[PDB]
From a paper:
Bacteriophage T5, a representative member of the T5-like family of siphophages, serves as an excellent model for studying the assembly, infection, cell wall perforation, and DNA ejection mechanisms of this phage family. The T5 head comprises 775 copies of MCP gp8, arranged into 11 pentons and 120 hexons, forming an icosahedral shell with a triangle number (T) of 13.
The T5 tail tube comprises 40 stacked trimeric rings of TTP pb6, which form a right-handed helix with an axial rise of approximately 40 Å and a twist of approximately 39° for two adjacent rings. The lumen of the tube is filled with TMP pb2. Each pb6 monomer contains three domains, two of these domains, pb6D1 and pb6D2, constitute the backbone of the tail tube, whereas the third is a protruding Ig-like domain. We only built an atomic model for pb6D1 and pb6D2 from residues 3 to 378, which contain a β-barrel structure, including three α-helices and two long loops. However, the atomic model of the Ig-like domain of pb6 could not be built in our structure due to its flexibility. Comparisons of the backbone of our TTP pb6 with those from X-ray crystallography and from the previously reported T5 tip complex reveal high levels of identity, with the exception of the long loop. TTPs that form stacked hexameric rings exhibit common structural features across most myophages and siphophages, while the trimeric ring is unique to T5 and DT57C. Despite the symmetry differences between the T5 TTP pb6 and other tubes, the pb6D1 and pb6D2 domains of the three pb6 monomers exhibit a pseudo-six-fold symmetric ring. The three pb6 monomers within the ring interact through the central β-barrel structure, with only long loops of one ring extending underneath to interact with the adjacent ring. Structural comparisons of the first, middle, and last rings of the TTP pb6 reveal that only the long loop exhibits slight conformational changes, indicating that TTPs may not play any direct role in infection, which is consistent with a previous structural study on TTP pb6.
Author numbering:
A (entry chain C), B (entry chain A), C (entry chain B): 3 to 377
Write the structure that this text describes.
Amino acid sequence: LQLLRNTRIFVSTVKTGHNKTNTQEILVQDDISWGQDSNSTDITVNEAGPRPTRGSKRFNDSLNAAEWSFSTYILPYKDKNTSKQIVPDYMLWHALSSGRAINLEGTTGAHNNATNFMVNFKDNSYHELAMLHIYILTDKTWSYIDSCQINQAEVNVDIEDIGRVTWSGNGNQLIPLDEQPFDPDQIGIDDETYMTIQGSYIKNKLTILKIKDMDTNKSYDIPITGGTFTINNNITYLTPNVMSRVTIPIGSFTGAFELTGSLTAYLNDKSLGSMELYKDLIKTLKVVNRFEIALVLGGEYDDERPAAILVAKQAHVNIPTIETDDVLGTSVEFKAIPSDLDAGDEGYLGFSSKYTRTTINNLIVNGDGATDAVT
Amino acid sequence: LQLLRNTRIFVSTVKTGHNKTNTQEILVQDDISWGQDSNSTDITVNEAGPRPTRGSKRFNDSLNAAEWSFSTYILPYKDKNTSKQIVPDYMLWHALSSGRAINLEGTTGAHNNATNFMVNFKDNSYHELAMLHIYILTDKTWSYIDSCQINQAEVNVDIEDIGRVTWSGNGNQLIPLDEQPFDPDQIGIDDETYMTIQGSYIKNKLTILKIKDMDTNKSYDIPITGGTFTINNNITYLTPNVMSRVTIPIGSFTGAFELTGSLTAYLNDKSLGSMELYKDLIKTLKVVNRFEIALVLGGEYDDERPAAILVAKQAHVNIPTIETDDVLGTSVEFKAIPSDLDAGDEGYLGFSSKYTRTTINNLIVNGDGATDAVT
Amino acid sequence: LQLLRNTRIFVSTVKTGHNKTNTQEILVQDDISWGQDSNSTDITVNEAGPRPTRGSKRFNDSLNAAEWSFSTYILPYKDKNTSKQIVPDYMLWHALSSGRAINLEGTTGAHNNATNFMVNFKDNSYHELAMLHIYILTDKTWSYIDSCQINQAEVNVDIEDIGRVTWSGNGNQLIPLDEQPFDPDQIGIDDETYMTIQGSYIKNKLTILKIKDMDTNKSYDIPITGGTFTINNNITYLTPNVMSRVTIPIGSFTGAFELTGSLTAYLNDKSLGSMELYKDLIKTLKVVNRFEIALVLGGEYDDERPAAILVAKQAHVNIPTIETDDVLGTSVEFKAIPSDLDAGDEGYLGFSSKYTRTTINNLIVNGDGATDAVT
């Protein structure tokens, strides 16, 4: 028998070669779900005779796209090889953010500094976004999915649980493989790295919102009681239709990048509170809203603390809806809107093991934690 | 913070002026739900190029109709000012039943007497039925919904709970207001009224059904084990479509009055029992059924007891369906059908704190508790 | 009052005459659900006037098909009158499998020997498959459903509960019959038969799968951890449309015979295991798969044990899907495909109180439990 407790998920770019730089291990939770489905057509005969021909041949006409959704953690840890903080699943973020292949240093989709690891969507303008091969250890069978381009990355601010993203991706085909592709233990998570990983956890009870109105330069102090965040590169797979053969999908195309999320907060009648935001949105009706929303999973402490900051420079905010709990709270929905519909300006993510108030403010102002005017 | 325990819902007829006659307080339960939604259109670009333009501007194009649904009680209490028994939410019943403004004495939609308060739908043939403004205390903020026209009033005979109606209405717009419209303490429920309110409760375990066949003059003795009742003035809101502005709904129109309900009873094989009704409906198939259905929430006692009587002079009754519980019970559905499709003859509700058998018979036969032949 | 504990369901072939040969009693569980519904059209008026005509006459225009679904057991017991083992509900299986009336001895849909009772689907080429009248004793009322042709029979291998089938059929009409059609106690289950019934139970924890690949002559050792099986004679009832009358359905027609099921098993990496089947199905993509699936509700023992064998000579098997439980298991779906779309070769069922390994192999190889080559 094979146990789910022993499952390992490895992410790689090339089929043949396999070293620690090109592929690593993902510290998946017990939410893994993969598989493939087929489109089957049933042929039935319906003729008006005295003796009907009751039968139905079934034909497999095409294959769908292989689907996988594992739920790893948010673990920004310092890299021993080069003093630049890297999350264990940086390649998944890169495949989400850019089509160019693994340019860690050069400012692109997956750019990391000594201080901060940060994810830009400026280069997210390609079809077939950074094909990645994912190897899954169903105990000891080594089954992988070929050419996985990821579809969704969802952060859920559970307000009472550790930071965890839930990836989703549409692979071309799921291939079992009799033999091992590479060496598991050497490639996957060493103990020395695992120590920093265990030290880099994010609580999500220290999340603080920084909603600001670009129209009026008004900043709101909102205590988040829960929220949701999702990135959805809408991938639709093109499958040729051959009548007498079983066809696998070819190509993946793309859709509309949707950096979207939801934010829930309690109703406070103080100044620059949640109720003031509700009144501002309900009283003034605007076709387009311009908000700067900063989701900092960690706190903004005058100390080195792990955090997974999020920013959306301009984000349309829907009308808040009053939710009647024991203590009333409003849930706002926000969808990042790129500028000029060409450049990637929806937002960017920042992961690092050490975040301070100054560095968080730096990333909020400009892309990295380099400088900030600060009066 | 703002708590749901302190919520108060005030129903008013006029905006500026505010006295005890024009508006009162509704003793709502903890099922309040109000809010507004907006229709947002997302613009995406899908062109066949080497570099796709992955972006999506989002626009707010129109506003929907504000939705509110609180669940108050059925509390017919005698009025100190005039000796006519009035429910605390009488003008809500009036807005359900008529468009003319609060003609309490004159026989219309909300007609009251010393003996009975009754709700007639004879004048329920207007568009824009009796606009009412509803003020909501989310703790202390005084946010209201402008020009609420109620949509549904549902009575649920739970058999084990106090009589409670669950209103629903589609308001034009939700306006927060910084300041108080009126004085909450003087306008809403005084202690002297509250005493009679506590004294006028309806148990719902004393309900008795009085189904009679107008075709065959056959009366059935049915012990109700549960049931449902709903009045639905279908309201669809007309919103202008302006491309470059956010439009709020103008006007409300009106649809088909639907006094509908469901009744469940155990299967008794006695004479004039539920099984006899089932056999009568299943054996004889008629295009139109004519039944007189009377739902008396209180009991018919030789004494003064509170009750919330319903009568439907002619009501089409669907075919009963056998529900296989531990003890088998049939569920019948009935929808009151008006005569001539012009006058309001679907039915009428009778609320009062003191009902006797004679008064219940009076209201079942004729409109009020004046006289009945009984020879 | 009437209790569900006393409900008895009798299955009969003829209306007037009633003996033990024509009808018996079905040992139904507490899942009985019968009833009838009607198609009602509501007429509403929507005209643009200052005074809308708010009203809605409701008309009953037609009747649907009466629906019933009881859940009896799988109880193959030896018949005292003739030494041929017969299940208590053999008429239901006969109506499922054939249109010709009760040829128990010879070769048809319900063909039984001294060894095995069997359900053959070769003769399911008729509309209006073997009309049966089912009498339901809701305590003491004796109401039946007229001309019931069954639509579905489902076997659920719960892996921890006794074998039980869940019939479903669309009867023409539900008729009360205040008087008794026949004598209940004499017709239904005597104590002597009930003893063998208590002796004939099937545990379902001894089920064995015998998937074999007709293409490659490869046999898989698969331990079932659960599964499903269903036979679905798609019955669509033709109801005439008369405007001014209530019409009951006339005729029943028939659809495509669908012997379908599902199989769930744990992932074993042994030889000829579930993992081998998964690899064979996922690595090789074929338009049509030809599998011989033999699902025995009982076990194969070198002794006389009750069992309910099932076989599908040609069964298309869909692509297995990995289910991520604590121990990973794959769920395969299989739909029997008849040969030439004219003869009934989807499969056949075998019920008997005594199966040995030799008799099970007999029924798997050829139709009867007579001989098999074995050398």
